[model samples]
Target: MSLDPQLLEVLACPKDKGPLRYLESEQLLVNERLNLAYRIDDGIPVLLIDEATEWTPNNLE
Candidate 1:
C-alpha cells in the first residue's frame, strides 16, 4: 500500500515521540529515535506500544 504524506507527518513513536519513516521493503513504520519498528498489517499500521517490535540490523530493511 502507498503511504500518505500527511499520515507520515503525524505518526510518532509512542516511546520517544519522534518522527517515523516508512520502510517500504520491510513494510513498517520505523521510529529511529526509539529504535523500534511498528508493524503495518494489510495496509493498516498497528501503533500499540506493547505491539511495537524492536529493530535490529536484520529486521530493519
Candidate 2:
C-alpha cells in the first residue's frame, strides 16, 4: 500500500527535524542531508533512527 500523502506532507526526520522526501517507488522516506532512508512497510513509515537505512550518493536519485 502507498503511504498517505497527507501524512507524508507532515512527516519529518526525527534526527534533524527537517523535511523528508518520499520515494514512493522505493517505499523510502529520505533525509538527504543525513543520507538516511526510512522504510515504509505496509504503508507505515518506520521513522526510528535505529531502523533507518544508510543511503549513499549512489543509492539515492
The prediction achieving the highest TM-score against the true structure is: 2
Candidate 2, position 18, lDDT: 90
Candidate 2 per-residue C-alpha lDDT over 1-61 given as tens digits, one digit per residue, 9 for 90 to 100 = 6856766567798888898887868877888888888888998888886887888655545
Model 2 Cα displacement at 47 (Å)?
A: 0.6
Total backbone clashes of candidate 2, pairs 3 or more residues apart or in separate chains: 0
Per-residue lDDT of 1-61 in model 1, one digit per residue for the tens? Answer: 5856765557777767776777879778887766678988987888887888878644544
Error of 1 at 16 (Å): 2.4
User: What's the count of clashing pairs in each model shown?
Assistant: 0, 0
- Whose lDDT is greatest here? 2
Which residue ranges in model 2 land beyond 4 Å of their true spot? Answer: 1-7, 58-61
lDDT of 1: 0.76
Q: Give the least accurate 10-residue stretch of model 2, judged by summed lDDT.
A: 52-61
Superposition error at 60 for model 2 (Å): 14
> What is residue 44's positional error in candidate 1, in angstroms?
0.9
